[PDB]
Design a protein around this ligand. Structure first.
Ligand SMILES: CC1(C)S[C@H]2CS[C@H](CS)N2[C@@H]1C(=O)O
Ligand SMILES: [Zn+2]
Ligand SMILES: [Zn+2]
Length: 219
């Protein structure tokens, strides 16, 4: 059936987790998120699709001696938030922007217990930053920046070979948001997309190019 949850070291104290789902109309979708280690503590950057894999992801780090201090969801879709309910049931703090929690509530989905609003937010000061470049893939999508490793988790915003499903997208705003994102993190050493392979800062340019190309054809 579906492939198993995967966990791979990317850099010191930085892991990529990859989960898999059948999405009607698209087949098997891979989803990359991160687990970031601060000392003996771990932060989930997005949850896997399901409580099952969220649980597997968590026990993997706990069994290796890391306390799960919290999770942050980069946007409201299931591939970033699907594990929030299970995490909440274990009293592991969950984080999302006000807009994300609003979009979850509208959909009748479980909200993160902690919310933030504003362009920038430190989940962990000087270690894990959250940035809102504007609407793109969804109205609420944010990225997560690791200044010590110069690693950017781009989430589902980063779409280098095509925009994917535009159901909740803001096609007008996406080029402007992508330009802002490129401005801010052009010096990223690594960029981690949700649905494609890890690349360098060039993925920011391609995303902008795909966004611009996507808008013109819309007209
Ligand atoms: C374009 C897709 C295959 S369809 C959509 C469902 S979940 C995930 C985005 S959140 N997704 C795929 C994608 O964007 O790669
Ligand atoms: Zn999405
Ligand atoms: Zn996604």
């Amino acid at each position: 059936s579906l492939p198993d949850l995967k966990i791979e070291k990317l850099d010191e104290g930085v892991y990529v987790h990859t989960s898999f789902e059948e999405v009607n109309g698209w087949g098997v979708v891979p989803k990359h998120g991160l687990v970031v280690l601060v000392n003996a503590e771990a932060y989930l950057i997005d949850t896997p699709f399901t409580a099952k894999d969220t649980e597997k992801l968590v026990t993997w780090f706990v069994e290796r001696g890391y306390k799960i201090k919290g999770s942050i969801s980069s946007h409201f879709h299931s591939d970033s938030t699907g594990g929030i309910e299970w995490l909440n049931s274990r009293s592991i703090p969950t984080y999302a922007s006000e807009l994300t929690n609003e979009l979850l509530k509208k959909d009748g989905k479980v909200q993160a217990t902690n919310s933030f609003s504003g362009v920038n937010y430190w989940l962990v000061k000087n270690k894990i930053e959250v940035f809102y470049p504007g609407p793109g893939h969804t109205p609420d999508n944010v990225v997560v920046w690791l200044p010590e490793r110069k690693i950017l988790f781009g989430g589902c915003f980063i779409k280098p070979y095509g925009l994917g499903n535009l159901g909740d997208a803001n096609i007008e705003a996406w080029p402007k948001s992508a330009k802002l994102l490129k401005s801010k993190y052009g010096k990223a050493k690594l960029v981690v997309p949700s649905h494609s392979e890890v690349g360098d800062a060039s993925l920011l340019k391609l995303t902008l190019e795909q966004a611009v190309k996507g808008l013109n054809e819309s007209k």
